């Protein structure tokens, strides 16, 4: 009964109290009313700033991120990489690229504000019509797929958790077990 309960609760040692955080998106109430420990921000003066400034039910996170916003993406990557930050809200394409580049960075569940990448033009520039048709000309054939092949599609239990010290004890106590026999030499 003791080995049955022990075999049960050693398996339950890694089931109940797991790091199952799994925030996966915007709807975490720990981030709705944030503390100063779950640190999250974005690029100062970006599209994310206006997108969270317009929405009246996401202003509170704004009042967090006004204390933490940065200027470049790579400095935020290095800050969250060494755990100086704790979360990072950003565009999904850049994060899915850099998580594939470096496997310590992990992307997660939700895909909100489904938008697209545009091209800045004037009001009535003559380079508006044929360029907007040429983008979809690239969509209809596989040239956008070839550019995805260049960059986007382009990629790059252990049973030693709690018995490592037990492994050290097995590798070490053999000398003491033979020293017991050296004591038994003096017993004879």
């Amino acid at each position: 009964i003791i080995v049955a309960s022990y075999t049960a609760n050693l398996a339950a040692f890694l089931v109940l109290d797991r790091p199952e955080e799994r925030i996966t998106g915007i709807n975490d109430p720990r981030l709705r009313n944030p503390s100063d420990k779950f640190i999250y921000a974005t690029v100062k003066q970006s599209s994310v700033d206006i997108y969270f400034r317009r929405q009246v039910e996401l202003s509170t996170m704004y009042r967090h991120m006004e204390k933490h916003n940065y200027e470049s993406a790579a400095e935020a990557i290095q800050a969250v990489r060494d755990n100086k930050l704790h979360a990072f809200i950003w565009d999904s394409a850049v994060l899915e690229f850099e998580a594939s580049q470096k496997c310590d960075l992990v992307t997660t569940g939700e895909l909100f504000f489904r938008s697209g990448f545009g091209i800045g033009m004037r009001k009535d520039s003559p380079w508006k019509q044929n360029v907007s048709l040429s983008i979809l000309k690239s969509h209809e054939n596989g040239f956008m797929e070839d550019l995805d092949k260049t960059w986007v599609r382009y990629q790059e239990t252990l049973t030693f958790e709690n018995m490592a010290g037990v492994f050290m004890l097995v590798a070490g106590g053999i000398v003491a077990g033979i020293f017991l026999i050296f004591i038994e030499i003096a017993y004879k």
Partner: protein, 148 residues
């Protein structure tokens, strides 16, 4: 037929590399039998307290650079790519006095006449579309979290 292009150093899209000796790009190949068509681009070093004035010729390549090369291959025009003088996309911020709004960043260098076409990871929203016209999108994304 010489359209001024402005962009920003985006980590999957616009790779900015310093030149080798003097204005020369290390013309490396791809993994498929194609040299990376880099372009000579200008732009500053870093932030205004850090770098007051450091603009060297640089090598820009990647995704949107290939998109611009496809557009210049299809439509008959040359270009001259520079970069923006800060690290901001562009927002709607009041200046100190006169009760006047301003757009900085890529829209700042656009609406000042210093650019004519922004090829960048440009997020489409209601505010920018009220002031500049957009084309149809070429890559669709959302928003998510990066964790460890």
């Amino acid at each position: 037929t010489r359209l001024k292009i402005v962009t920003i150093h985006q980590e999957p899209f616009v790779y900015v590399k310093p030149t080798m000796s003097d204005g020369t790009c290390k013309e490396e190949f791809t993994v498929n039998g194609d040299p990376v068509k880099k372009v000579i681009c200008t732009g500053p070093n870093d932030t205004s307290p850090g770098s007051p004035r450091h603009t060297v010729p640089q090598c820009c390549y990647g995704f949107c650079i290939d998109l611009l090369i496809k557009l210049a291959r299809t439509m008959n025009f040359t270009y001259e790519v520079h970069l923006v003088a800060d690290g901001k996309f562009g927002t709607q911020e009041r200046v100190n006095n006169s009760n006047k709004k301003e757009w900085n960043g890529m829209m700042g260098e656009l609406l000042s006449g210093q650019a004519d076409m922004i090829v960048a990871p440009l997020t489409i929203n209601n505010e920018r579309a009220q002031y500049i016209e957009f084309s149809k999108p070429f890559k669709y994304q959302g928003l998510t979290i990066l964790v460890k």
